[PDB]
A paper describes a structure:
Metagenome assemblies of the recently discovered Asgard archaea, the closest living relatives of eukaryotes, have revealed that homologues of the entire ubiquitylation cascade, ESCRT-III (and Vps4), and components of the ESCRT-I and ESCRT-II subcomplexes are all encoded by the genomes of these archaea. This is striking as Vps25 is the subunit of the ESCRT-II complex in eukaryotes that recruits ESCRT-III to membranes, triggering vesicle budding.
Eukaryotic ESCRT-II forms a ‘Y-shaped’ hetero-tetrameric structure consisting of a Vps22/Vps36 stalk which binds two Vps25 subunits. Structural models for the Odinarchaeotal and Hemidallarchaeotal ESCRT-II subcomplex proteins generated using AlphaFold 274,75 identified potential tandem winged helix (WH) domains, which they likely share with their eukaryotic counterparts, Vps22 and Vps2579–81. Inspection of this structure revealed that the Asgard Vps25 core is composed of a tandem WH domain repeat, consistent with the predicted AlphaFold 2 model. B Superposition of the N- (blue) and C-terminal (wheat) Asgard Vps25 WH domains demonstrating their similarity. The alignment shown superimposes the N-terminal WH domains, only, and yields all-atom RMSD values against the Odin N-terminal WH domain of 0.7 Å and 1.1 Å for the yeast and human N-terminal WH domains, respectively. A similar alignment of the C-terminal WH domains yielded all-atom RMSD values of 1.5 Å and 1.1 Å for the yeast and human domains against the Odin C-terminal WH domain. The same appears to be true for the Asgard ESCRT-II machinery which, based upon modelling of Vps22 and Vps25 proteins from Odinarchaeota and the crystallographic Odinarchaeotal Vps25 structure, possess two very similar WH domains. This suggests that all ESCRT-II proteins were initially derived from a single-WH domain protein progenitor, with Vps36 emerging during eukaryogenesis.
Author numbering: 1 to 173
Amino acid sequence: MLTVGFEWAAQPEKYPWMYSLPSKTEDFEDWLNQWSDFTLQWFKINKLHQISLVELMGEKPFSYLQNKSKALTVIVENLIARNFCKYTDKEYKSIRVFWRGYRDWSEVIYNWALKKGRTELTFFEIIDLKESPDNFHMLPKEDFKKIFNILVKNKRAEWINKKNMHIRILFLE
């Protein structure tokens, strides 16, 4: 490795070649690996699940890229191929970065409900929390629909009222 630990992200002026898109095939693959691995870490460490591409372009070190639009579209394409990312919709303006899948979210949420003594949960009560483990309270509404389905399917919950996204927690031990 030319550089280690994404040290190029910490001081962009010292590593300016990391901010130009390379044109040679070999160089471009290795650049893309570095930025794709970085961007996955940046979302995970910031416990962020989604964000518009224009907002991403205002954040260090993405803010130092030349051809921001073209550089992000190829990084995102790479994260999609590696099964860590999806665009949010057909307008291709925002991305959803899956550094954790729904099956793991469902255990994080179940364990938190047990540890906090809750016997029922609603979507509203979760999204109105002051804070939560790994910012689960910030997951998009569609992700909650799927997480609650998983909890019910897996016998860890049952529906009190599904049209209100309201579940009862089922106890095992």
